[PDB]
Design a binder for these strands. Structure first.
Lengths: 206, 220, 91, 388, 81, 87
RNA sequence: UUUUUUUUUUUUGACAAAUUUUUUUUUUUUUUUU
């Protein structure tokens, strides 16, 4: 097991709250996933956050286990998460796939978009289903920042988050980046919170 | 040659030795040269070619369609199908596809446990279209009891003694042979008693030396 | 009718991508610039290319066109949206 | 553009550090005192490399050249081979392996070659890392006579450990009388660049042991004609050489087929006294090194300044003075005092590129890494780019 | 789903389910002891009605029958015994 | 598999799914091999030292790899909570 | 301010019988003398 220092600290929790990551789904939590900390009156289901943190920690712990860091792929057709995935790509070794996916990015060369990833990470499995399905055919694990109502086909280590609002995705990706720096890298865990403000991530406006 | 894909490099640089290894970690073969390099003895067999006609405003696109079965007599075979506007090309690409999609065969004993396997391990069925193909373990000195195509496929497969039992419209070598391929394939995908012990799950050669044989650059 | 073809359009686009310095929004200057800048076979084709470049430049000035990017447009990356101090966390 | 510093280990050896090769896990460092010292590349950012240093006294005369080879062949056998030649001219091989739990580096010595061949006085050498072009790996070595020895190295031989060095060939001396072979290099394409002490560079193809062609000195007159460091671009045919004049440093570049020249690297203007001699460094160029990506070329001079040269541009990218503090601004020119040398007088020995992320930190995998060694014995490590 | 324990589930995910499709079948019908308005003494009554029950001694209405649970008329206290 | 004189054959013994214990045959390309890192003090990576988890293509297709993986991670020893044996 | 708005439709029957098509692996030079 991991040390006690790699747990959900108060400030991190506060940050998570500020975003509204814990906000789940209006219509349904699909029984695929049991990540609910009792529903709110006249609204959505609340997510067990600690669980989410633990999942993130795993995801990072899997990302670090991959030898070459640039064969991680950050999938994003979601306009909200494009800048996020770019920033994450810049920070980690990982390569980005912003905007349109273009089928056969994993299946079969000749195309220039042919990348052969060891691991794939996704923003949303609903909007980027083509990516996931492609990942099915060529032996790739998938790590999607899942919603509760959104589906769960072929997704491993699903991180239960809000993926509706701006302040959520950029946050999760940022956290992941921080973790993968804490693992395998320079930054100390407890003494250094890291002063790269999550305002760096998030969508454009305009 | 000049291989694309990560496997292509590994096979080229002499990292991956056997096809067994690839089979273990279940990595998808996209270049036909890989398997050729791995397994040299592999020989082809054009079972059947038939013409097929796309009817059109003017006349007919009479394109051919060849079924090629490749394999060596040591538990590896591959069925390949291809259509083309000429026969040669069709046969060629059929061989290609066949090499690409090779499968291993869990071949074992009838009952007695003596020097080297001879028949199939378990009773396997494969279906394709209307055709079903049940392959059954047979004792020593039984031989291949099947129709010509299937017989040939099994001769290539490296199976000595075997009973077969089919159903449906067998006059369509395509579907029959496909079913056979499926069935021989499903020999491994079937739980035996001797394979109940827990293995430690070895790490892939694609995982181990990724960095030392990744997609290179060197512009000059 | 008067629709510009593939080799005129694509090549024009390519030119704008790797020659944004120069290519001022006048036809005649571009016309000779094209003869200098790259080998073109016929006169007609060259002229067409020049015209399309002129058109493109004319419509680059008003806003950033989707498809083309010529390194001058790049800069907005780290300094993309640290934009608009609203002027007069909790609570 | 700019190269940020990761760390620097001061007072490494007793005598001068001559050569410094690198691999996936660690940088090997030879020296004049007689120790072989490996230094860990996997460092935790805020740490002195002395903490992960492992010494091994090999020969009292000292070690001027050393070369490393880290690779896998059968399943997952982490073959790390360190070969070295002492000041006595004695060839020694060492396989480097760590313990399972403790992680203590065990310097297991190897005597693969017989005593008849170890007798010969060697100098420079290099490992040609094969990729199934040869069945196993390749090795080259120079000597006092110029009879450049080449070995078809086999680590396995029916899989179980059984290392042998079968002799590929011996490319004899270029001219009679002979010349002292100063430097050597081998490429993946299969060419043997042999450097000599009179500005001569003998190029030999690997297959038939035949000389393809050779260059001569640019200087026709002595004012330091000798070759410093022959080097190849990894895949491509571009071939890099370094020679001097009367106390200067000059880089020269050629193509690997026709032998047509392409560019002498230089810097002009007034502080070099107008400058008839268009030279690269104000003092001798002690080391050259291509990066693993191909384009861009490093060059270390005795004057202190690491000049970086883009081979596409045929012009300097940037300088970096290793010994003395000279960052930020750069009014770039060769300092030529009327006596002879520049006013800058440090002692550089060697420089070397490392692949995109063999280090660990913020400057790791994002960027490539840079290694270098000095006369004061303060071995250094530098990150690159600074844009990630 | 896939892998779970059905021997010890939760009271949360069992009290919700039907009487017949629990692990051990059991009714959802406690017994109640009503204190009537007239008399001071109790009346032991089953929570579900079926018939319209009146009091033991001073015969007046206690609980009327409905589609399910008994309709206890007016202000009358009760227990779960 | 072992013939008369012991002596193992049956070229290549295949993997098993960590969840279902179903055989991961060659052509099953939907199947996955997760590789997880083992940490030390101050977390950190430790390169070349992993814990593997093989998952069948079928389960992924069905869309309940998540849960079983969570279980696998919990009972082995790299989490608390997350998965629940009593649903 | 779920929100605009639409109007219809003849007659044309037939065409003699027989009448295309099929194969598998791939490969080109010339020149004596001192």
């Amino acid at each position: 097991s991991l040390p006690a220092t790699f747990d959900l600290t108060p400030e991190d929790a506060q940050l998570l709250l500020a975003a509204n990551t814990h906000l789940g789904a209006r219509n349904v939590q699909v029984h695929q996933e049991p990540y609910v900390f009792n529903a709110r009156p006249d609204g959505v289901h609340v997510i067990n956050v600690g669980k989410t943190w633990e999942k993130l920690v795993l995801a990072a712990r899997i990302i670090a286990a991959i030898p070459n860091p640039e064969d991680v792929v950050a999938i994003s057709s979601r306009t909200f998460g494009q800048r996020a995935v770019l920033k994450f790509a810049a920070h980690t070794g990982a390569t980005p796939i912003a905007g349109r996916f273009t089928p056969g990015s994993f299946t079969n060369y000749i195309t220039r978009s042919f990348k052969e990833p060891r691991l794939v990470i996704v923003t949303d499995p609903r909007s980027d289903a083509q990516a996931i399905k492609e990942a099915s055919y060529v032996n790739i694990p998938v790590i999607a920042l899942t919603d509760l109502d959104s589906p769960s086909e072929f997704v491993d280590v699903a991180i239960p988050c809000n993926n509706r609002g701006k302040h959520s995705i950029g946050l999760i990706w940022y956290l992941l980046a921080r973790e993968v720096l804490r693992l395998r890298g320079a930054l100390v865990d407890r003494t250094q919170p890291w002063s790269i403000m999550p305002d760096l991530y998030f969508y454009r406006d305009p | 040659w000049v291989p694309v894909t990560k496997l292509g490099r590994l096979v080229k640089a002499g990292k991956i030795t056997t096809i067994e290894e690839i089979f273990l970690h279940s990595l998808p073969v996209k270049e036909f040269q890989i398997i050729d390099t791995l397994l040299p003895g592999l020989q082809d067999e054009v079972m059947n070619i038939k013409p097929v006609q796309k009817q059109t405003r003017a006349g007919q696109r009479t394109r051919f369609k060849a079924v090629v079965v490749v394999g060596d007599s040591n538990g590896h075979v591959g069925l390949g199908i291809k259509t083309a506007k000429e026969v040669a090309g069709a046969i060629r690409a059929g061989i290609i596809i066949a090499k690409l999609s090779v499968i291993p065969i869990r071949r074992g004993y009838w009952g007695t446990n003596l020097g080297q396997p001879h028949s199939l391990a378990t009773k396997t069925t494969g279906k394709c279209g209307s055709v079903t193909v049940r392959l059954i373990p047979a004792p020593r000195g039984s031989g291949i009891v099947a129709s010509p195509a299937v017989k040939k496929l099994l001769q290539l497969a490296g199976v000595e003694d075997v009973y077969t039992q089919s159903n449906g419209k067998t006059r369509t070598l395509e579907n029959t042979l496909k079913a056979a391929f499926v069935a021989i394939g499903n020999t491994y995908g079937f739980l035996t008693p001797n394979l109940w012990a827990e293995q430690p799950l070895p790490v892939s050669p694609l995982d181990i030396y990724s960095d030392e044989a990744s997609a290179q650059k060197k512009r000059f | 009718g008067r629709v510009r073809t593939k080799t005129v359009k694509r090549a024009s686009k390519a030119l704008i991508e790797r020659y944004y310095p120069k290519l001022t929004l006048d036809f005649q200057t571009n016309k000779r610039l094209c003869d200098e800048i790259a080998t073109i076979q016929s006169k007609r084709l060259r002229n067409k290319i020049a015209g399309y470049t002129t058109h493109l430049m004319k419509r680059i000035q008003k806003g950033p066109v989707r498809g083309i990017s010529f390194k001058l447009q790049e800069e907005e990356r780290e300094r993309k949206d640290q934009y608009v101090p609203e002027v007069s966390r909790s609570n | 553009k700019v190269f940020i510093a990761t760390a620097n280990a001061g007072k490494a050896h007793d005598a001068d550090i001559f050569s410094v090769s690198a691999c996936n896990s660690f940088t090997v460092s030879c020296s004049g005192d007689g120790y072989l010292k490996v230094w860990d590349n996997k460092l935790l950012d805020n740490e002195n490399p002395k903490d992960k240093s492992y010494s091994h006294f090999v020969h009292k005369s000292g070690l001027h050249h050393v070369d490393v080879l880290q690779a896998i062949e059968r399943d997952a056998f982490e073959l790390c081979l360190v070969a070295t030649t002492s000041f006595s001219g004695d060839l020694l091989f060492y396989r480097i392996t760590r313990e399972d739990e403790t992680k203590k580096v065990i310097f297991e010595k190897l005597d693969l070659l017989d005593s008849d061949m170890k007798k010969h006085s060697f100098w420079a050498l290099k490992w040609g890392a094969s990729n199934d072009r040869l069945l196993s790996h390749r090795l080259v070595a120079t000597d006092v006579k110029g009879t450049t020895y080449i070995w078809k190295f086999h680590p396995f031989a029916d899989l179980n450990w059984s290392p042998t060095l079968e002799l590929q060939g011996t490319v004899e001396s270029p001219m009679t009388p002979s010349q002292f072979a100063t430097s050597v290099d081998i490429s993946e394409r299969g060419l043997i660049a042999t450097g000599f002490n009179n500005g001569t560079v003998q190029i030999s193809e690997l297959s038939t042991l035949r000389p393809l062609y050779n260059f001569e000195s640019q200087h026709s007159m002595n004012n330091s004609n000798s070759i410093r460091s022959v080097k190849f671009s990894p895949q491509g045919s571009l071939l890099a050489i370094a020679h001097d004049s009367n106390s200067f440093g000059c880089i020269t570049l050629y193509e690997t087929e026709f032998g047509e020249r392409i560019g002498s690297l230089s810097v002009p203007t007034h502080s070099s006294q107008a400058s008839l001699g268009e030279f690269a460094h104000s003092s001798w160029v002690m080391s050259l090194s291509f990066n693993d990506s191909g384009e861009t070329l490093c060059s270390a001079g005795w004057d202190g300044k690491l000049r970086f040269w883009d081979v596409k541009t045929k012009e300097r990218i940037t300088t970096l003075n290793m010994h003395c503090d000279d960052i930020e601004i750069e009014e770039d020119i060769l300092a030529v005092d009327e006596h002879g040398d520049s006013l800058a007088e440090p002692g550089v020995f060697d420089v070397k590129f490392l692949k995109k992320g063999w280090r660990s930190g913020m400057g790791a995998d994002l960027n490539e890494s840079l290694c270098c060694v000095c006369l004061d014995r303060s071995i250094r490590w530098f990150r690159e780019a600074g844009g990630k | 789903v896939l892998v779970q324990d059905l021997l010890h589930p939760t009271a949360a995910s069992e009290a919700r389910k039907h009487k017949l499709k629990t692990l051990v079948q059991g009714p959802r019908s406690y017994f109640l002891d009503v204190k009537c308005p007239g008399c001071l003494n109790i009346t032991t009554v089953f929570s579900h009605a079926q018939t319209a029950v009146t009091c033991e001694s001073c015969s007046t209405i206690l609980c009327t029958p409905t589609g399910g649970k008994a309709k206890l008329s007016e202000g009358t206290s009760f227990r779960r015994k | 598999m072992e013939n008369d004189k012991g002596q193992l054959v049956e070229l290549y013994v295949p993997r098993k799914c960590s969840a279902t214990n179903r055989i991961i045959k060659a052509d099953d390309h939907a199947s996955v091999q997760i590789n997880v890192a083992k940490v030390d003090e101050e977390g950190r990576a430790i390169p070349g030292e992993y814990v593997t988890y093989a998952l069948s293509g079928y389960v992924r297709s069905r869309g309940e790899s998540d849960d079983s993986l969570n279980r696998l991670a919990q009972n082995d020893g790299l989490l608390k909570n997350v998965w629940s044996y009593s649903r």
